Design a protein around this nucleic acid. Structure first.
Ligand SMILES: [Zn+2]
Ligand SMILES: [Zn+2]
Lengths: 62, 114, 899
RNA sequence: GGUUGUGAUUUUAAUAGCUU
RNA sequence: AAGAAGCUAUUAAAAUCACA
């Protein structure tokens, strides 16, 4: 479970990285913080909700 | 290869000489003991342009008081302000408290006024 | 009882309270007693003095020594001779009746609770618990109210940078104490008394109060010896940042109250020498402001330590390369002409100025920096120098690629199930747009540290013995082994091409000429700091130095022989060159465990090792490695090589993201000798814990005549003599090798110490390491990360990031390393960048991981065993999609078999 | 633009050597 | 016999991993 979501985050950043999202520092920092903190996350549902936040953010930029 | 590398080194060295600001250095260099000044302070005393990277609005407040900055025993006027993204940011926005919504590490391009 | 008190009360207005009546208080107290029976710096129990709390002052105490009736006249006369000076506490002398005879009484007034020794000792020998004395002293001095200790990590220097603020308050006490000691020594000289002065003789108020062992002599002919006084507090003298009251410039750089021409001052020779005479008038040993004047490499250690202590008072901008305008290429440009090392002092280039000659100019920062606008950055406490014309630009980190197929296969095999105790724990964390600079800010932990020279000269001698086996010397350019096409050459040269281009560009004769030049001058260079794609188990970013080309070319040409001798040797106490394959790991652990009686294993690691490295001990290591150029180079050449090594590696201008900086200190991973220098550092720290613990053994209680003799000789060699006798050094080297065996790799190692000698404090247990790291590395070794192992059979809990297990076979019992399963799985799953087109690269990755994972096959845990076989099956599948060299497990089996 | 060390593996080439 | 390969190392380069 954790691994399932934990790995799933990496692909999301890669998708974003292709979109030069780093052009604006704020969004890139937000995404990086969320990813890094979910990776260290040990209890699933919290990781799940941060992953949902990531996905919601990505869907905004398509 | 040998010719190309040494030629490129010559070109870079000549570029440095071009951007050296030769006169300003000597005017202050030869006052010190035997004309020897630490390299760590030569630009701050001889350079014409000054860049500063703030951490937040509070650093902005401390560093400047009326759009000018005091550093290395000299007064520096703020010409242009860039944010993280490099976009122009005018003094009106930073002065206002609303800068909270703005990217924090502002960088200011300051110039020497004597 | 009150009758006895009445004598004291009369003069003191009777505003006193007794502790448990007239009975002497049973309290342990630090001491520095050198005597026929004892020669120790540990604490003892003395019950020959009564302590009365002065109720007037919040801390003052009245202490009376009711002993030595026959010594009253001696004490009385000495006090009369010395009372005139202002550094002696008040004394009262009288005799009181008791039983069948009278005994003398010496009452000392308004003395503070704890002696300066009790501080210097307590600050050293620090530990998490049993730290009552330090807390009490901090409260009494008013550094912080007791509420400050609710923060259970208050003492940690890396978790509470506020602690340094607390200690800085004690800086006043230390400075006052030194000044009072100077006055007291002067008074002893004038009055004609001879004797040694020890911290037990002085109170926090700074007044001396005990004269029992002193001796009278001709007026003005006295001789005080304070070697152990000054030297002992030197770590405290550096930690609590005393002398801050002597700061040369007392205004901020960007504060309006400042002068432009002020910065140009760099000499500070008179400042430093005047400070030395003001505070250290009685140090006996000469002080050289500029180390270039030193003669013996040991003298450099002493003078440079003192320069480090005074380094605080000088402006931070004064240091750095010393350049000047000069006529070059017909265009007058600023040229480097000298360097102002923090420790070594002013050094000027011997020779004044062809590709051999012209090449250095393009790499020397002197030309580049002067041609750039100035830069002030508030992100990092470290200083900033200038910024290029193009302006600053940040750089970000992208996460690694996720290999979905491998993950799916792992899931299929049944891993990462809801069963616990196994899961991914390493990932390619991503970092912000400018994490490069914010990581460089971590060098603020590199606070100046002053190691006590008297006790560190001996340790330098000892550690030098650990490195006498190898061989060094200089080698002509043609003989240097070069990893050509080095992936970088530093900012000045990385534009044109890789390092090879320059290697074949420069013919060997020019390289030799440049080396000979370096043996006469100083040639500083940048070091382009940069980020590092690398899996990690924690969010922290990682960056590496990447020193420029010219440094490595000459640096390796000076150390190569020594380093090669280090790697090639086997069985030594430094195991850099040894392989863990072919049973090498078991050979290492068998050598380490050999000889030690009642063996027990311990380990550790230095927090923030690369950064917290006290920029002094790095210099010491730089001298040890180079110490073997006995004949190839004269002393001056050796000194210039050392200072150039420091210039390139310690205080070099560090480029990054278009914004120059000036590194406070600490190591740079890009150096050739980083691993070797760190190994020397680690040996130094491990030894020094031994000397520290040994001196505090409470000689009177010991019975191992060997150990008693050993500490008596050690003490008599540290403080009470000038030249250390090689005899004692070799004896101590043997003693350490007989009960404290070390195996050191770069900056990590394991120790197999005798349990008995450690329990009685005859060798450095963990607590010793806590103390030494605290007052010398200036960081705190969190008890969690270290460990001990009271049974060798289980082997080390971890060494070099790998566990160890014992397996019994037809070959018998022997040890095998095995990495953490989670780390291996993770390395399998994630890759730094998108896999290249050729899947063969994947085959190499996975076969190498299997090789590193084979030992788990023997592991006890059923789940761990699955790891190796699963990786084997994956490589089988990969190859099939694309053999015995890879198909068969036996191929991995032979990798972990002897010969 | 993506460091230097020290192990290790794989390939490739050269070098000889051995065996068939 | 040549020749041929196989094997064996040694050397060199690349590629790749682990470790600090
Ligand atoms: Zn000296
Ligand atoms: Zn030499």
């Amino acid at each position: 479970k954790l691994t399932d979501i934990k790995c799933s985050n990496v692909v999301l950043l890669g998708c974003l990285s292709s979109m030069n999202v780093s052009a604006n520092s704020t969004e890139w920092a937000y995404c990086v913080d969320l990813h890094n903190k979910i990776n260290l996350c040990n209890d699933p549902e919290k990781a799940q909700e941060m992953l949902l936040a990531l996905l919601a953010f990505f869907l905004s930029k398509n | 290869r040998k010719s190309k590398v040494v030629s490129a080194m010559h070109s870079l060295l000549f570029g440095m000489l071009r951007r050296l600001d030769m006169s300003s250095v000597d005017t202050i260099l030869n006052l010190a003991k035997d004309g020897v000044v630490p390299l760590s302070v030569i630009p701050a005393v001889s350079a014409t342009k000054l860049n500063i990277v703030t951490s937040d609005i509070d650093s902005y407040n401390r560093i400047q008081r009326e759009g000018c900055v005091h550093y290395a025993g000299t007064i520096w006027n703020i010409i242009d302000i860039k944010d993280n993204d490099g976009k122009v940011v005018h003094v009106k926005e930073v002065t206002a408290q609303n800068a909270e919504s703005l990217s924090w590490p502002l960088v200011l391009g300051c110039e020497r006024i004597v | 009882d009150m009758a006895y008190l009445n004598r004291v009360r009369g003069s003191s207005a009777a505003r006193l309270e007794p502790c448990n009546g007239t009975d002497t208080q049973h309290v342990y107290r630090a001491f520095d007693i050198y005597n026929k029976d004892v020669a120790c710096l540990g604490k003892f129990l003395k019950v020959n003095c009564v302590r009365l709390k002065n109720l007037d002052k919040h801390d003052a105490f009245y202490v009376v020594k009711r002993c030595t009736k026959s010594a009253m006249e001696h004490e009385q006369s000495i006090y009369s001779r010395l009372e005139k000076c202002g550094a002696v506490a008040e004394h009262d002398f009288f005799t009181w009746k008791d039983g069948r005879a009278i005994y003398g009484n010496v009452c000392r007034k308004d003395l503070t609770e704890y002696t300066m020794m009790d501080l210097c000792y307590a600050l050293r020998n620090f530990d998490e618990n049993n730290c009552d004395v330090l807390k009490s002293i901090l409260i009494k001095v008013g550094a912080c109210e007791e509420s400050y200790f609710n923060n259970k990590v208050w003492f940690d220097p890396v978790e509470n940078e506020d602690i340094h603020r607390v200690y800085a308050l004690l800086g006043t006490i230390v400075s006052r104490a030194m000044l009072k000691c100077v006055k007291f020594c002067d008074a002893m000289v004038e009055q004609g008394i001879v004797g040694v002065v020890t911290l037990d003789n002085q109170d926090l108020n700074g007044d001396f109060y005990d004269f029992g062992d002193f001796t009278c002599s001709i007026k003005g002919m006295g001789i005080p010896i304070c070697t152990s006084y000054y030297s002992y507090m030197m770590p405290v003298m550096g930690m609590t940042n005393c002398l801050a009251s002597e700061c040369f410039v007392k205004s901020d750089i960007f504060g309006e109250d400042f002068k432009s021409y002020d910065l140009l001052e760099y000499d500070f020779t008179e400042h430093k020498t005047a400070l030395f005479n003001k505070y250290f008038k009685y140090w006996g040993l000469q002080y050289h402001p500029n180390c270039v004047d030193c003669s013996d490499e040991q003298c450099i250690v002493h003078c440079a330590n003192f320069n480090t202590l005074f380094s605080t008072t000088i402006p931070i901008t004064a240091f750095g390369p010393l350049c000047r305008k000069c006529w070059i290429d017909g265009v007058p440009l600023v040229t480097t002409a000298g360097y102002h090392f923090k420790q070594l002092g002013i050094v000027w280039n011997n020779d004044l100025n062809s590709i051999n000659e012209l090449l250095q100019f393009c790499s020397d920062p002197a030309l580049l920096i002067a041609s750039s606008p100035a830069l002030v950055d508030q992100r990092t406490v470290c200083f900033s120098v200038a910024a290029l014309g193009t302006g600053m630009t940040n750089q970000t980190v992208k996460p690694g690629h996720f290999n979905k197929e491998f993950y799916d296969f792992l899931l299929e095999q049944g891993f990462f199930s809801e069963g616990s105790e196994l899961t991914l724990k390493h990932f390619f964390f991503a970092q912000k747009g400018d994490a490069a600079v914010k990581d460089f800010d971590y060098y603020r932990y590199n606070r100046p540290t002053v190691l006590d020279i008297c006790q560190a000269r001996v340790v330098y001698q000892i550690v030098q013995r650990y490195f006498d086996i190898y061989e060094g010397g200089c080698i002509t350019a043609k003989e240097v082994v070069v990893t050509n096409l080095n992936k970088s050459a530093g900012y000045p040269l990385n534009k044109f091409g890789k390092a090879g281009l320059y290697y074949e560009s420069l013919s060997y004769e020019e390289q030799d000429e440049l080396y000979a030049y370096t043996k006469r001058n100083i040639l500083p260079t940048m070091t382009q700091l940069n980020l590092k794609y690398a899996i990690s188990g924690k969010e922290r970013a990682r960056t590496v130095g990447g020193v420029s080309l010219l440094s490595t070319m000459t640096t390796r040409q000076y150390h190569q022989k020594h380093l090669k001798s280090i790697v090639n040797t086997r069985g030594a106490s430094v195991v850099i060159g040894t392989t863990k394959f072919y049973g090498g790991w078991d050979n290492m652990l068998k050598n380490l465990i050999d000889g030690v009686e009642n063996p027990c294993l311990m380990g550790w690691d230095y927090p923030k090792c690369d950064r917290a490295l006290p920029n002094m001990i790095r210099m010491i290591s730089a001298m040890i490695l180079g110490s073997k150029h006995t004949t190839c180079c004269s002393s001056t050449d050796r000194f210039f090589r050392l200072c150039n090594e420091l210039a390139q590696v310690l205080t070099e201008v560090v480029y990054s993201n278009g914004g120059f900086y000036l590194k406070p200190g600490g190591t740079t991973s890009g150096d050739a000798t980083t691993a070797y220098a760190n190994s020397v550092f680690n040996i130094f720290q491990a030894v020094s814990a031994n000397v520290n613990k040994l001196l505090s053994v409470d000689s009177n209680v010991c019975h191992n005549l060997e150990v008693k003799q050993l500490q008596r000789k050690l003490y008599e060699c540290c403080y009470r003599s000038t030249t250390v006798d090689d005899q004692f050094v070799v004896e101590y080297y043997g003693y350490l090798r007989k009960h404290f065996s070390m195996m050191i790799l770069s900056d990590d190692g394991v120790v197999c110490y005798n349990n008995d000698y450690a329990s009685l404090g005859y060798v450095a247990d963990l607590n010793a390491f806590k103390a030494v790291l605290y007052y010398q590395n200036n960081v705190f070794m969190s008890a969690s990360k270290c460990w001990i192992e009271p049974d060798i059979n289980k082997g080390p809990h971890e060494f070099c990031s790998q566990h160890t297990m014992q397996i019994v076979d037809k070959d018998g019992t022997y040890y095998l390393p095995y990495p953490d399963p989670s780390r291996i799985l993770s390395a399998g799953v994630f890759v730094d960048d998108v896999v290249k087109t050729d899947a063969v690269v994947l085959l190499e990755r996975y076969v190498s991981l299997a090789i590193d994972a084979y030992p788990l096959s023997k592991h006890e845990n059923p789940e761990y065993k699955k790891v190796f076989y699963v990786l084997l099956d994956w490589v089988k599948h990969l190859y099939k999609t694309l053999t015995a060299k890879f198909w068969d497990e036996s191929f991995y089996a032979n990798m972990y078999e002897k010969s």
